[PDB]
Amino acid sequence: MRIGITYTVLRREEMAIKERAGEFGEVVMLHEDDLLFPGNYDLDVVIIRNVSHFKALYTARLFESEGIPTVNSSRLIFEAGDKLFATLRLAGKVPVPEWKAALSEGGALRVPDSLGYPLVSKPVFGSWGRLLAKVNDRDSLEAVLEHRKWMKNPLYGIHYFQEFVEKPGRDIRSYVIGGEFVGAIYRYSNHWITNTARGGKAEPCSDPEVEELSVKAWEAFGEGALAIDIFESEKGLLVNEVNPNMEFKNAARVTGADMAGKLVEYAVEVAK
């Protein structure tokens, strides 16, 4: 068994993944500087850990083109990593916050007619809670749209919104690998944006309903290793997003669950 790991920097995540991969067989640590295609790679599977989402997406697709399977797959990285594509996949199968998508500023201005205020505006490709906005009225909506308009990225012209959900000072982050629930935490914060990346604090979550809902949410995609974000609302549990390049250092610390081991064990299952 020969296992590649692609990375940008060696985070705690990647060191743990390397150790666990080394228990199964030979490990090949592939910095982005070592990624050049077409090329000759002798690998049974590649575990994709690039920090940039888009770099993760393309490096998965490139290894696939060399006949090397990838965890996660390029398909999953794109489908789960885009908030709009991901909620469209989720909406069949699990409860999600009410949402709206518009293709222009003029259409976006009609979103409050469906969702009401307050609502949340967020980019389709973001992570770590960046560019999230709680919009309480029309003036705020107009300000967000004006700023999105003047940014370079044409992806900011896909306007994705959700109802603002009143959470009890926290949200939930769940881990499902290969269809198996591996663990969950609460992320607490004094701010409505609860990411550990922005100072959210982890507590272990043993709620059996989040386990059940998380597996179902994973099943909407049917492959891979996903971090799942769930909100507690007055209507019950809602699946918000799914993340295909999971961070877990805090979750693992807080829960005692071996996210790195489960990831690797799933990758070698996928290899053979």
Binding site: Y7, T8, V9, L10, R11, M15, M29, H31, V51, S52, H53, F54, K55, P123, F125, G126, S127, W128, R130, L131, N153, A197, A227, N243, P244, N245, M246, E247
Partner: peptide, 30 residues
Amino acid sequence: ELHQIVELEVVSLEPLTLEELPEVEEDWGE
């Protein structure tokens, strides 16, 4: 190892020198 982040980023081995992590981009994360 040649890119460990430590409490920032190890840029070099032969002469071991630390350096600040790069600019956070708009697609960085999970």
